[model samples]
Target: GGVVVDPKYCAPYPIDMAIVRKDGNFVITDVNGNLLFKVKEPVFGLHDKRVLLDGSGTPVVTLREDRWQVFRGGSTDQRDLLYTVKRTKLDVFLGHNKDKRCDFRVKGSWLERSCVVYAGESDAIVAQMHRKGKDNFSVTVYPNVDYAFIASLVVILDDVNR
Candidate 1:
């Protein structure tokens, strides 16, 4: 058996992210250890301190902008692009916030704060990546993309390992 680092740490098994499947129902637990707020989802980040539980402990689907799109070279038409920023990367994203937008802050606890140049959706990481700019958003951790924010919707998902 592995040694215990801390007594309070809640041990969990790595499982599929889907909760809709009936077989996965047993994996879903409403036990929040007696917290007043409803813990829907639980995501242990790159570090233990970065754990997150959202919406009654429901699993979250993190869709980075680059995941859906790539740095497919910039377009000449301004209409094709949303906006660009010289700021690190997160700021360039926060700069995109408007009256009505598809992306916004999740209104939950922030953890494992990191900042870096990223190429996914600007709106997704702006609030999380924050001022540091170390967690630059590539589609799947490809470092920084050449252009600013690309349209995340256009990105197609695939398995590079296969």
Candidate 2:
């Protein structure tokens, strides 16, 4: 199974979302142009820090560049760590399994603006993303998946590789 940030964020049907670059930040919106989330980066910081906010402007997670660790809300404490992303030769690992195995794996090329998020070390894809334009990304989140989690991963992938 893939990481479930919150079961409420999972949808029964596939969701279509888009990420649009706004200035130096990003805005995640639904196909109908309703804002879902926003990504903001601080102006000054030794280590890159990003805040993912919901449509109501509530912080959902804080992404830190140092260890590629994501924390709940704006916290950076060890106890608040949601997950850590580790890059490998062939894919990126979203670690959470108790046996030291990866709970999710990301494959495909960010340069090409296409990627797939797989559940665990399996071929079951939970989400897919493709670039629509220079600063626009189209995302398809499969049914019974946490779309917020997928959006967060997309933000991380952009930050790490862009």
Candidate 3:
């Protein structure tokens, strides 16, 4: 358990922490694509997981102070914010998780491309794997990698494990 990221981070999530005032007063949402927690007072973001708020609408109370760490518990899987990140991107760390590789995952644009892949942990970059978008491009392998097949199997493995 490192840091919790709601439906947020880089590509997804309609809003980013410290940028938007989380529209829901009593309903919490993020890139997790679901309601994680609720808020009663107004909230605003300050760079690096800092926020300004008074109270949270949850049984577990964590006062949104002027300056404080977002991931008090290093787990964004939950919303009530005993622990979480100001943004989903903060969740990207080289930990032992599927998301571990996402931080270093490279991405770029192409003139024109598409493909049909079951998607396993393989070299997506060299294979010209362009799906979802240019930003989604990545090449990741374990300590021991195999190159016969194609597509980002790491993504598939992560998706499966998660």
Candidate 4:
């Protein structure tokens, strides 16, 4: 909840990045279906983990789910640790509580699919994500926001849901 976006990762126009699962992996693109990047499973990982790569299959980021903490961590080459997402409440209390909040929240709007990623839990928005359809995502990042980096976050969001 306290990760700030790097300026180099911000983009100009609201880039609409699309996401969809293909077989066991995932394919991400733009409104025009132009491939942006792909996330694939490696041979083995510690806990549930995946590697995000560019269209050319170059590693862009790494996503790891911290089951014990009920959170997820995004990193680059295991160097710069990016962001972390934590479940807002315990789902085990399901029927006992009526919180419409997302199962997890690193960033969001409970009633809508739209969510703006802020810097270190602050009001500074770095990028945003919204739903267009079941299993489909449209992300709009601020000027200079790295499309690939934002795309990785979207993937991390999906990973948390599962």
Alpha-carbon lDDT, every model: 0.22, 0.74, 0.25, 0.53
User: What TM-score would every model get versus the actual structure?
Assistant: 0.19, 0.84, 0.20, 0.64
Q: What does candidate 4 score on TM? A: 0.64
Instruction: Using lDDT, give the best candidate's number.
Output: 2
Runs in model 4 deviating more than 4 A are: 1-10, 44-47, 66-105, 109-112
Per-residue alpha-carbon lDDT of candidate 3 for residues 1-162, written as tens digits (9 for 90 to 100):
111232121132123111112322333232333433333333254312222222232222232221212222222233433321112111222223434333222223222223222212342332223333012322222211221111112222222223
Kindly provide the TM-score of model 1 when superposed on the true structure, using C-alpha atoms: 0.19
What candidate 3 gets wrong by more than 4 Å, as runs, is 3-26, 30-34, 42-57, 69-162
Q: Which runs in model 1 stand beyond 4 Å of their true positions?
A: 1-74, 88-90, 93-162
Backbone steric clashes in candidate 2, count: 0
Q: What's the CA error at residue 44 for candidate 1, in Å?
A: 46
Can you write out model 2's per-residue Cα lDDT over 44-103, one digit (the tens) per residue?
A: 544478888897888888878724777878787878877787763123344343355677
Candidate achieving higher TM-score, 1 or 4: 4
lDDT by residue (tens digit), candidate 4, 34-118: 7777776654544466777666676666655533111122343323554444443111111112444322234574236666665
Supply the TM-score for candidate 2.
0.84
Clashing pairs in 4: 9-145, 9-146, 10-143, 10-144, 10-145, 11-143, 11-144, 11-145, 12-143, 12-144
